[PDB]
Amino acid sequence: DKVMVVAEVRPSEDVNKVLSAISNFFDFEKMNTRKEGIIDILVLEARTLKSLLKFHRVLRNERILDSARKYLMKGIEGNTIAFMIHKQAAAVGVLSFVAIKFYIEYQNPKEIVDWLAPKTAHGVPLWDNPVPP
Amino acid sequence: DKVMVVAEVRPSEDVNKVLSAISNFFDFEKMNTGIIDILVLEARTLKSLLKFHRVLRNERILDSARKYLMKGIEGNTIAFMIHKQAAAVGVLSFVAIKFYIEYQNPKEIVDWLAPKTAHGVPLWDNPVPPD
């Protein structure tokens, strides 16, 4: 029941700018770094979906719930949801789906899509569920 | 007549790492700066490419450089690119880092930087072209 974000850091990149871009939407708890040549790979993890509260908030402040529901629904596979957001956009405080990789381990994935990406009527959320248990 | 290097600096990149990348092969005399920054570095003397000149010989890639440099000639300019990440780690690999050289006799630049070779050895060793 954890979330994991993976992102690369090339030699011209500043590991702290990548982590800071991710912090905009993810309050990670753990971090290990791995390599694939001259490229570092960040694997960030958190145990609770609460770690995605800032993600929940941005989808609303940006008014892109419509778009987020399709990307998230499409990203469901089994008991996991996987999606990607634009890295540079993220670096400037903007969330845009498409890189920063997100992986969510949860039994009822659908409850996650509805929690942060509800259907909308004229931009207004048709419902506002609490963070899934 | 000048040497100019242009490189992008994305929000996730460190301008210092990109400047260091270029520093491995070029010594700028001045620099200028959507959500992406464009770094423009330039020099007025060809001595600014002495590091480049040294690396092609040390790593013994003269043949490869001549090919890329010669084809890079258009009119009185020479245009070519090198790999950003490779350059960030000190490696010179020809293609995001763009080189633009203005000079009235471009082939001289090429023969200075990348002499034709026979059996892996430079057939000539010209001095840096004037200016």
Numbering used by the authors:
A (entry chain B): 2 to 99, 109 to 143
B (entry chain A): 2 to 34, 38 to 99, 109 to 144
Paper text:
UPF0201 family proteins constitute one such uncharacterized, archaeal specific protein family. The UPF0201 family proteins occur as a single globular α/β domain with approximate dimensions of 55×35×35 Å3. The protomeric structure consists of a five-stranded, anti-parallel β-sheet, five α helices, which are located on one face of the β-sheet, and three loops connecting helices and strands. We have further documented that all members of this archaeal specific protein family share a common polypeptide chain fold, which is evolutionarily related to the RRM motif found in the ribosomal L5 proteins and many other RNA-binding proteins.
For 10077b and 10077c from S. solfataricus and S. solfataricus P2, respectively, full-length constructs bearing C-terminal His6 tags yielded crystals and structures. Pairwise sequence identities among the structures we report herein range between 15–22%, with exception of 10077a and 10077b, which are 35% identical. Our four UPF0201 structures represent subfamilies N149845 (10077a, b) and N130963 (10077c, d). The crystallographic asymmetric units contain one protomer in 10077c, two in 10077b and four protomers in both 10077a and 10077d. While 10077a, 10077b and 10077d all form one type of dimer (typeI), 10077c forms altogether different dimer via crystallographic symmetry (typeII).
